[PDB]
Amino acid sequence: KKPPARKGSMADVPANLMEQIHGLETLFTVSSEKMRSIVKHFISELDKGLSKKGGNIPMIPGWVVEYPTGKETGDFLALDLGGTNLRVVLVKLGGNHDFDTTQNKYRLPDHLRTGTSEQLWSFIAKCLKEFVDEWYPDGVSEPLPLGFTFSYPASQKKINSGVLQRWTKGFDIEGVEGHDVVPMLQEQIEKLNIPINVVALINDTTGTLVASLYTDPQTKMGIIIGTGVNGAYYDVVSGIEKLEGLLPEDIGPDSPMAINCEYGSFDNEHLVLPRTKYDVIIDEESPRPGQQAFEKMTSGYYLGEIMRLVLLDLYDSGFIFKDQDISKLKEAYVMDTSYPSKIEDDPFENLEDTDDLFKTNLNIETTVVERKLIRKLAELVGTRAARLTVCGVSAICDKRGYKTAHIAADGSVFNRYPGYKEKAAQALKDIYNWDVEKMEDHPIQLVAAEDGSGVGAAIIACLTQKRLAAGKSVGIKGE
């Protein structure tokens, strides 16, 4: 039994502060009408991204050109390469929308993030060899098809290729950007005579879509709502004008095509996104000003920072923390996502969880009325983030004409942000005006995803291998 929401009476809050809360409410509220307008623009930009001219939204073809039917069977590998860890996963598809996993994880030695190309790929291969040797001590009938989640910006002219465009997350390995990483990993596999074929390179959201669709046939989208944000869905080849002239005959106009949207870049021009002066500051102070605008409005990573800047603004205008030492509130990113999470979770009318948090982490003694403001603020910023995120869901559903859908979701915000599911479901209900009483009955609803970067990569490897074995294309002509 988790506690009921606190009542959260505002009766005792001073007028001077109540006016400021009201100011922040008006500022952070996203109306049904504003959401539906954002969605309209979002749809144009999803289409723009697929067009020969392209757009701000990458809309990257994932080269998965069929839906998993759930009937697939067999043993497939996945490799998930993170910044600190890699996971090797063996997936046996049971052919009734079911699967079994056997998996290892290996911590990436600090060295590798800045070492040589051969060192990165030999370490990966050595992990693969240790894994395969244990699970297949007799060796193997046919090699194992492997799907490789390489979640770094890469371009693909076909699924079994991935040309690194730019390392992220502290990786500084020379000689890899501009090159196809698939042969790099494959030749280290070969050097160790490990029976594996690397057949697919994917982004993890694409894996999220496909794995969840294999187990849940109502899945129409995979979404990540966490430190970064992304969505993936199936479009149709006839709707991807930028592939016109590039496709072999066996990838026809009505072929499905999984798209990795990379929609974190939606509305960098801020035509529709409701930027406050706080989002302005967060943007101008970020590594990349003017970029990742939709990411900056929906990601878990900025939610405490938004609160921080708001609280500082109220301190400077003389509203709160009067005669407190707030020199810790001045540090950028000192309030991470656990701040509005802990604040929203507070079950006490006197908000004692919040009291402790602000006293112990930030050395600020709050009055009860200041806490009621902090909590109101936490709610508004959690709530707006969820409301903006479902604008992406709604754009993809509307573009494709999905009147019902399971949206398979993952990431730290969906999984752990307090009341996030309730917020998202209410936002969808507001957009569509459904006459439905309970969230479990929403025509469009977010559900917990399957493991995109392990299970999804292995199912993609299954789908891919079947095409490669038949000589069906998984990329543009000639590649």
Ligand X SMILES: OC[C@H]1O[C@@H](O)[C@H](O)[C@@H](O)[C@@H]1O
Positions touching a copy of itself (CB under 8 A) are 1, 3-4, 6-7, 9, 12, 85, 100-107, 130, 134-135, 347-350, 352-353, 355-356, 448-451
Residue 53 interacts with which of a copy of itself, ligand X, none, CB < 5 to 8 Å by class:
none
Smallest distance from ligand X to CB 259, Å: 12
Distances (CA, A) of 367 to 15, 36, 65: 15, 39, 58
- The answer on whether 34 is annotated among ligand-binding residues is no
Q: Which residue lies nearer to a copy of itself by CB, 107 or 438?
A: 107
Contact between residue 355 and residue 343 where contact means Cβ atoms under 8 Å apart: no
Q: Which residue lies nearer to ligand X by CB, 151 or 465?
A: 151
Q: Which residue lies nearer to ligand X by CB, 255 or 265?
A: 265
Nearest-CB residue to ligand X? 228
151 binds ligand X per the rule CB under 6 A: yes
Provide DSSP, 360-424.
Answer: HHH--PPPHHHHHHHHHHHHHHHHHHHHHHHHHHHHHHHHHT-SSEEEEEESHHHHHSTTHHHHH
Q: Which residue lies nearer to ligand X by CB, 161 or 203?
A: 203
49 binds ligand X per the rule CB under 6 A: no
Cα 419 to Cα 2: distance, rounded to the nearest angstrom: 12
Residue 204 interacts with which of a copy of itself, ligand X, none, CB < 5 to 8 Å by class:
ligand X
Q: Interacting stretch for ligand X, rule CB under 6 A, among 5-13, 109-117, 181-189, 227-235?
A: 227-235
Selection from 343, 329, 265 nearest residue 297 by Cα: 265
Q: Which entry of 75, 151, 267, 308 is annotated as an active-site residue?
A: 151
Query: Looking at 86, 146, 229, 251, which residue binds ligand X (CB under 6 A)?
Result: 229
Smallest distance from ligand X to CB 410, Å: 8
By CB under 6 A, how many residues form the interface with ligand X? Answer: 13
Q: What angle do CA 398, 234, 478 make, to 5 degrees?
A: 140
Asked if 166 is an active-site residue, the reply is yes
Query: Looking at 227, 291, 367, 426, which residue binds ligand X (CB under 6 A)?
Result: 227
Residue 104 interacts with which of ligand X, a copy of itself, none, CB < 5 to 8 Å by class:
a copy of itself
Q: Which entry of 204, 235, 267, 398 is annotated as an active-site residue?
A: 204
Which residues face 200 on adjacent strands?
147
Cα 164 to Cα 183: distance, rounded to the nearest angstrom: 12
Rounding to the nearest 10 degrees, give the CA dihedral for residues 412, 415, 418, 419.
140
Q: Which residue lies nearer to a copy of itself by CB, 343 or 449?
A: 449
Residue 151 interacts with which of a copy of itself, ligand X, none, CB < 5 to 8 Å by class:
ligand X
Q: Which entry of 98, 133, 166, 327 is annotated as an active-site residue?
A: 166
226 binds ligand X per the rule CB under 6 A: yes
Residue 203 interacts with which of a copy of itself, ligand X, none, CB < 5 to 8 Å by class:
ligand X
Contact between residue 109 and residue 123 where contact means Cβ atoms under 8 Å apart: yes
Cα 125 to Cα 119: distance, rounded to the nearest angstrom: 10
Selection from 273, 214, 211, 262 nearest residue 95 by Cα: 214
Contact between residue 411 and residue 399 where contact means Cβ atoms under 8 Å apart: no
Q: Which residue lies nearer to a copy of itself by CB, 211 or 391?
A: 211
Query: Looking at 68, 222, 264, 304, which residue binds ligand X (CB under 6 A)?
Result: 264
Q: Which residue lies nearer to a copy of itself by CB, 158 or 376?
A: 376
Which residues face 76 on adjacent strands?
91
Cα 177 to Cα 17: distance, rounded to the nearest angstrom: 53
Q: Which of residues 165-224 bind ligand X (CB under 6 A)?
A: 203-205, 224
Bridge-based pairing state of the strands 219-225 and 405-410: parallel
3-state SS track over 32-99 = HHHHHHHHHHHHHHHHHHHCCCCCCCCCEECCCCCCCCCCCEEEEEEEEECCCEEEEEEEEEECCCCE
Binding site, annotated residues for ATP: 105
**Which of the residues are catalytic?**
151, 166, 204
Binding site, annotated residues: 105
Contact positions toward ligand X, by CB under 6 A? 151, 203-205, 224, 226-230, 262, 264, 411
